[PDB]
RNA sequence: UUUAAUGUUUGAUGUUCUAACGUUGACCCGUAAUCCGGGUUGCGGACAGUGUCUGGUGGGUAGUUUGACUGGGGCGGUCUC
RNA sequence: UUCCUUGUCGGGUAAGUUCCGACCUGCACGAAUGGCGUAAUGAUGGCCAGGCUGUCUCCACCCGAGACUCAGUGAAAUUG
RNA sequence: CGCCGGAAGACCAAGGGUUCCUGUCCAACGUUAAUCGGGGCAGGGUGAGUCGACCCCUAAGGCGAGGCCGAAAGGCGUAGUCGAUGGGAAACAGGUUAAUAUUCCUGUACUUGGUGUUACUGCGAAGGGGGGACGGAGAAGGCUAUGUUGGCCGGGCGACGGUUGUCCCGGUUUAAGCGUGUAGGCUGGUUUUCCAGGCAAAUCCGGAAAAUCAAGGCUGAGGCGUGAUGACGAGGCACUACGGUGCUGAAGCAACAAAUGCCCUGCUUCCAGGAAAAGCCUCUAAGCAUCAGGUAACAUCAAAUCGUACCCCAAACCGACACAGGUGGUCAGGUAGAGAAUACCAAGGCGCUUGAGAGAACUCGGGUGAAGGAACUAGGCAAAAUGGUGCCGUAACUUCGGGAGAAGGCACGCUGAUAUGUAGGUGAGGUCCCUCGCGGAUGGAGCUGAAAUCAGUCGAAGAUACCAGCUGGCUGCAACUGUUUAUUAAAAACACAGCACUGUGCAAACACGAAAGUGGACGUAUACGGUGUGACGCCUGCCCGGUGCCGGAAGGUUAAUUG
RNA sequence: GAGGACCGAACCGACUAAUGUUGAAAAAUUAGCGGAUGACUUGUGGCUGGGGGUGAAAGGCCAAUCAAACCGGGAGAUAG
């Protein structure tokens, strides 16, 4: 449910917020939280190495299980929760042995559903199998690229991966970008898509709403002086040059992938 | 209005104190120069 | 000390450009 | 001038392999440790990466240059015979 | 954004180089170095009206602090 | 006599360091004199088991054995060890010095350790679990600090008309601790069996099942009792170096109103989803097993060291000055008021370290102004005006919220009646009930108390002072709240939500780094970087020759290398 | 009982005028003025270092200094 706010204020006129009534109204599970302090985009030299990062709301890190290696033991979904550190929601699951873990909540999951991990699990959303056991053409998410390392592909809200082909020791996947990729068939994947697909319909509505997320303002390069940016300078609004980054590399078109040790795994680049 | 010198004895010692000079090679060269000159007070201390 | 304020001001100084 | 046959490698391209090399995969130990090192294993694999030499690109950065005459300078004209 | 230019026509004024509406002959507008609109907002730019007034016609008087005299202390720029 | 009184009073942190108090001096300092002083000289003054530091514990961050990396110097970082601005045991009232007090004295308390005796007994961590332990806003309800009036007690009977009364003034204060367990808030309880979990074990935590009981538990301000037959106390009396000292001592209650303080780290709600570690409680492992250890009572000893004066919105700190400047926290009385605004006051503290005259021009800060009313000027600059509350009424346009406090208008004091003070709030006694109390019901004394209507009345004026919007019409620019040239520019500039192009498949692109490494990000294409445009509405046309980027690979040209 | 909502003190700012300009002050005072639950404000501590930082971008700020800080040295640079 996306709801448009009424324009009682000029800062409310264009706000669209996403309200999920099934999120837990309460505190998170304390044993699985951690400290997570902010950086400001600064590295261990103390220097801004990424721009436009700063401030925001205080957050605590939820230890999410991306490996899903509690094999054979069935677990039941206890509740769905908000996570400030990712766009998707997280589900608290309880194992039959009495252990509790967080997972990425797939689409259609509710409290009380049963999920299982391991090679013998059934083909239902939320279940994790090695990709040699998943039929070709299935929609999966939270895909591993190295066996035993944890899921790394298709983790944001609404995303999924398509298993296109299987040829011996590799499966061909259609990534969410449109890229075709090969990974080992022994890596794991979870059935279904990542929930919270209405994430992208939200509208922040005001400048201060982006400051609550840690995003500081962007100054256009053309508004600076020549000493600051390659685009700086002018009497009035003058450009007359090819657009570039602040460090003089051409933007708008120039390809920057240079990785020859992984070219073998990429069947086709995105179009 | 508000001026530049805003005293604080903790920040005075952590910045220019004896043990802060002794923590680096260049700080120990400052103390070498001030002994060679004959300064009555080497650092900003007690 | 610094210069007198009227000797710094452009309006007073720059009367014949 | 043109060949073909045997033997031989001279390269080049491809296909395999593993033993150099990589691992910001897993596990075990030093160990009270998400560093590091050692060990077992999986995956890549003579590729990647790094050194010397080399062509291209390179205001990202650096050092500098951008004449004189002239009824003020510039613009124009001139500068030798 | 229009040099010629106070273009021309209309409105407002007794009288309007400004302002508003139009015309188009755009020296030298124009479509994300965005075009054209736009309710609300602005210690934002221009113009008009009502109220109000010493802004003015054209100033007069009054209350205080200096200026002036007395006692004490006591500078400065400058200067053949 | 005048001024401050949400300070110009009181207490601190930071900072300073003897400025503090007493005697003494007036050469220099003090914008004048000085017998005075934050000045000179000499002497004195800072008392802690409980306040703060130190200490135990950690955040951001620092340093970092080994380690990885680097011409050298060095850089990063693991184990660790430091680092508060945060978490961790405990004291209150009264009295006293010229100067210190939660430190000294009186009274009454509390905390944590060690040692020993007695009684009983499974103790044990560098490990497991709990707890510590956490957001914004909002809404009330229960209270107290505090204040007002009455009652009570002591004094008074008035410089000028009146003043034995429904009159005037003053006081009416008491802590921590200990005992009780209330308005509230959270939670079902108890037993038994079993178990792929919590690195191993666990009786602890988590999970499963059955049985049974309907209550139990945790937390909690205030009040009440004691502390306290005490202390304090308006005054009175006795002396005095005239500063003070000594002695004695009444009443010490109730009602009402009420916080921004406490219950409350609570409750409701929202999305932007809101520290860590120890002290603490518990479980055990190795281990020890008549031991050690643990628990409880009693005795006993210990609680070290450092700070403590004074100023702290300032003449003591930062500004060269005894400088219209700057400086974090706590306290928070009355009358009017919505109020911490504003006016007058209390407690308290001050009158700003040159004065005396005169009453010219001119300058500064204000008051009033005949008739006119923007004619002034670059321009209504500056002034003047408007200004509250309640009710009536209010256009175009609109993104349907606005515009809007549009515009405009009416009422407003005091007195009496309704009503010897109403509607409302609080709520005693009494009676009834039971669970016998910090309870419920009934009841209405007493206290408090608007708003209105009617009638009258005074003035030129009733929002009387202070305080407290000028309004409307047309149009350019930027949507809007914000940000900016500290010290001549606050804007139409920057930002912005939204839009689009583009790079990036994760050891990501990209950025800081001779490197190791770090950020991006404990993120994963609904993500991240760069670039332009800049809410919304209607839209965004043609050109690929030039320059750039993207793709191609035939052919031409083409480096080191070979020779 | 929402809100980068409204009016308005503390608090943060700095739009206009007058004064001052050897000032009371090397940027203030008086009278008005803007925001005032947020992209707010503030105390304490910490980190970024000079062709470098940081910058809601003014060539702004980096100790009254900034189109390249300050201190010491090359150094008695050079100066038709
Ligand atoms: N004139 C003013 C402001 C000012 C200070 N410094 C200046 C220098 C130049 C011009 C003006 C100033 C004064 O003296 O206080
Ligand atoms: Mg960015
Ligand atoms: Mg943007
Ligand atoms: Mg600019
Ligand atoms: Mg450049
Ligand atoms: Mg131009
Ligand atoms: Mg150059
Ligand atoms: Mg040179
Ligand atoms: Mg010349
Ligand atoms: Mg026109
Ligand atoms: Mg244009
Ligand atoms: Mg153009
Ligand atoms: Mg176009
Ligand atoms: Mg264009
Ligand atoms: Mg004289
Ligand atoms: Mg007064
Ligand atoms: Mg002295
Ligand atoms: Mg004194
Ligand atoms: Mg004197
Ligand atoms: Mg003295
Ligand atoms: Mg420590
Ligand atoms: Mg004292
Ligand atoms: Mg009489
Ligand atoms: Mg003085
Ligand atoms: Mg002062
Ligand atoms: Mg202040
Ligand atoms: Mg006041
Ligand atoms: Mg006079
Ligand atoms: Mg008149
Ligand atoms: Mg008149
Ligand atoms: Mg005129
Ligand atoms: Mg004005
Ligand atoms: Mg115009
Ligand atoms: Mg604004
Ligand atoms: Mg300025
Ligand atoms: Mg200004
Ligand atoms: Mg723009
Ligand atoms: Mg090409
Ligand atoms: Mg607001
Ligand atoms: Mg500012
Ligand atoms: Mg002011
Ligand atoms: Mg306001
Ligand atoms: Mg410029
Ligand atoms: Mg400066
Ligand atoms: Mg030399
Ligand atoms: Mg020289």
Residue numbers in the entry:
A (entry chain BC): 2 to 272
B (entry chain B2): 1 to 46
C (entry chain B5): 8 to 24
Manuscript excerpt for this entry:
Free L-tryptophan (L-Trp) stalls ribosomes engaged in the synthesis of TnaC, a leader peptide controlling the expression of the Escherichia coli tryptophanase operon. Transcription initiation of tna is controlled by catabolite repression, while the expression of tnaA and tnaB is regulated via a transcription attenuation mechanism resulting from the tryptophan-dependent stalling of a ribosome producing TnaC, a 24-amino acid leader peptide. In the presence of inducing L-Trp levels, translation termination is inhibited when Pro24 of TnaC is in the ribosomal P-site and the stop codon is in the A-site, causing the ribosome to stall.
To address this discrepancy, we also determined the structure of a wild-type TnaC–70 S complex stalled in the presence of L-Trp at an overall resolution of 2.9 Å (~10% of particles). Although we observed an overall weaker density for TnaC compared to that of the mutant peptide in the TnaC(R23F)–70S structure, the excellent overlap between our wild-type and R23F peptide densities indicates that the mutation does not alter the conformation of the nascent peptide, with the obvious exception of the side chain of residue 23, which makes different contacts with the ribosome in the wild-type (Arg) and mutant (Phe) structures. Unexpectedly, the wild-type and R23F TnaC–ribosome complexes exhibit nearly identical conformations of the nascent peptide and the ligand-binding site, indicating that an R23F mutation within a region of TnaC that is positioned near the PTC does not induce an allosteric conformational change resulting in a binding site with increased affinity for L-Trp. For wild-type TnaC, the concentration of L-Trp necessary to obtain 50% of the maximum accumulation of arrested ribosomes on codon 24 of tnaC ([L-Trp]0.5) was 0.32 mM, while maximum accumulation was observed at concentrations greater than 5 mM. In the TnaC–70S structure, Arg23 of TnaC would also clash with methylated Gln25235, albeit less severely than Phe23 of TnaC(R23F), possibly accounting for the higher puromycin sensitivity of the wild-type complex compared to the R23F complex. Although we could not detect a class containing RF2 for the wild-type TnaC–70S complex, pull-down experiments with biotinylated tnaC mRNA demonstrated the existence of a stable TnaC–70S–RF2 complex.
